[PDB]
Design an enzyme around this catalytic site. Structure first.
Site, PDB file in Angstrom:
ATOM      1  N   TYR A 193       0.792  -1.219   0.000  1.00  0.00           N
ATOM      2  CA  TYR A 193       0.000   0.000   0.000  1.00  0.00           C
ATOM      3  C   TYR A 193       0.821   1.265   0.000  1.00  0.00           C
ATOM      4  O   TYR A 193       0.253   2.344  -0.118  1.00  0.00           O
ATOM      5  CB  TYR A 193      -0.944  -0.008   1.199  1.00  0.00           C
ATOM      6  CG  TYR A 193      -1.810  -1.209   1.218  1.00  0.00           C
ATOM      7  CD1 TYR A 193      -2.859  -1.360   0.342  1.00  0.00           C
ATOM      8  CD2 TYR A 193      -1.552  -2.239   2.111  1.00  0.00           C
ATOM      9  CE1 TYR A 193      -3.627  -2.517   0.374  1.00  0.00           C
ATOM     10  CE2 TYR A 193      -2.315  -3.393   2.153  1.00  0.00           C
ATOM     11  CZ  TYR A 193      -3.349  -3.527   1.281  1.00  0.00           C
ATOM     12  OH  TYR A 193      -4.123  -4.672   1.315  1.00  0.00           O
TER      13      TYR A 193
ATOM     14  N   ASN B  44      -9.937   1.822   6.813  1.00  0.00           N
ATOM     15  CA  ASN B  44     -11.360   1.932   7.090  1.00  0.00           C
ATOM     16  C   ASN B  44     -11.711   1.788   8.578  1.00  0.00           C
ATOM     17  O   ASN B  44     -12.889   1.896   8.935  1.00  0.00           O
ATOM     18  CB  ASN B  44     -12.118   0.866   6.307  1.00  0.00           C
ATOM     19  CG  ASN B  44     -11.985   0.996   4.782  1.00  0.00           C
ATOM     20  OD1 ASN B  44     -11.493   2.048   4.291  1.00  0.00           O
ATOM     21  ND2 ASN B  44     -12.271  -0.023   4.053  1.00  0.00           N
TER      22      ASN B  44
ATOM     23  N   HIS C 298      -4.252   5.943  -1.565  1.00  0.00           N
ATOM     24  CA  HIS C 298      -4.841   5.920  -0.239  1.00  0.00           C
ATOM     25  C   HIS C 298      -3.810   6.050   0.890  1.00  0.00           C
ATOM     26  O   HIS C 298      -4.207   6.176   2.057  1.00  0.00           O
ATOM     27  CB  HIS C 298      -5.647   4.617  -0.052  1.00  0.00           C
ATOM     28  CG  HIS C 298      -7.093   4.749   0.253  1.00  0.00           C
ATOM     29  ND1 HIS C 298      -7.873   5.846  -0.005  1.00  0.00           N
ATOM     30  CD2 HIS C 298      -7.931   3.808   0.772  1.00  0.00           C
ATOM     31  CE1 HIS C 298      -9.126   5.579   0.356  1.00  0.00           C
ATOM     32  NE2 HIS C 298      -9.188   4.348   0.819  1.00  0.00           N
TER      33      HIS C 298
ATOM     34  N   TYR D 224      -5.749  -0.627   9.391  1.00  0.00           N
ATOM     35  CA  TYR D 224      -6.313  -0.494   8.052  1.00  0.00           C
ATOM     36  C   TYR D 224      -7.118   0.792   7.981  1.00  0.00           C
ATOM     37  O   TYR D 224      -7.684   1.272   8.964  1.00  0.00           O
ATOM     38  CB  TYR D 224      -7.120  -1.710   7.548  1.00  0.00           C
ATOM     39  CG  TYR D 224      -6.253  -2.918   7.361  1.00  0.00           C
ATOM     40  CD1 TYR D 224      -5.491  -3.079   6.218  1.00  0.00           C
ATOM     41  CD2 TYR D 224      -6.179  -3.895   8.349  1.00  0.00           C
ATOM     42  CE1 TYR D 224      -4.685  -4.205   6.055  1.00  0.00           C
ATOM     43  CE2 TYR D 224      -5.377  -5.022   8.205  1.00  0.00           C
ATOM     44  CZ  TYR D 224      -4.633  -5.160   7.062  1.00  0.00           C
ATOM     45  OH  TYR D 224      -3.843  -6.292   6.915  1.00  0.00           O
TER      46      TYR D 224
END
EC number: 3.1.1.29
Length: 186
Positions: free
Chosen positions: A18, A61, A23, A59
């Site tokens: 990531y 979210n 993001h 994470y």
């Protein structure tokens, strides 16, 4: 010390997969500040100048799970919480401070709103634009920036680093005056 004067939260996901993705802009900004991060619970945390800088490892979210108990524990008011995140509602090359308001579908911001029970915390919104079709949104935010975008991302990261320090040291209004009008696009 025993108290914290502010909390800066970078949005992102944990792991190298990531690290270069859209993001993870918030993590990228925090990584430009020149701080020493340390693992503490489900986050990497740094201190400087009386407050805290957080890269949650929950994470993207789920960052409210880390942010809300910390902010409540340290009695940090909303105007001393800054969530630095990529924003699909702004084009790449725009940067905006926002005091409160909606999450506009951003799951990280929503997690924090739901966990705190307030929208009033501050945000540093780093535009990333949108994919050509909404059906590719998930892939878009989990992809690296394009070749042609890299010079703009670099400018945005430079501006955002300075903007974080601005907000820490000056509060939101002077920083909005300096940064919100910038056009960093090519």
């Amino acid at each position: 010390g025993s108290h914290m004067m502010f909390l800066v939260v970078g949005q992102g996901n944990p792991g190298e997969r990531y690290a270069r993705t859209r993001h993870n802009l918030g993590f990228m900004v925090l990584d430009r500040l020149g701080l020493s991060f340390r693992p503490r619970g489900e986050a990497l945390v740094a201190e400087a100048e009386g407050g805290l800088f957080l890269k949650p490892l929950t994470y993207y979210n789920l960052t409210g799970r880390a942010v809300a108990p910390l902010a409540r524990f340290y009695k940090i008011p909303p105007e001393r919480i800054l969530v630095v995140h990529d924003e699909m509602d702004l084009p790449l090359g725009r940067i905006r401070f926002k005091a409160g308001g909606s999450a506009a579908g951003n799951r990280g911001v929503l997690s924090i709103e739901e966990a705190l029970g307030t929208r009033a915390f501050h945000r540093l919104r780093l535009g990333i634009g949108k994919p050509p079709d909404p059906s590719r949104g998930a892939e878009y935010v989990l992809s690296p920036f394009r070749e042609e975008e890299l010079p703009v991302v670099e400018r945005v990261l430079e501006a955002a680093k300075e903007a974080v320090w601005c907000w820490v040291r000056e509060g939101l209004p002077p920083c909005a005056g300096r940064f919100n009008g910038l056009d960093l696009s090519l």
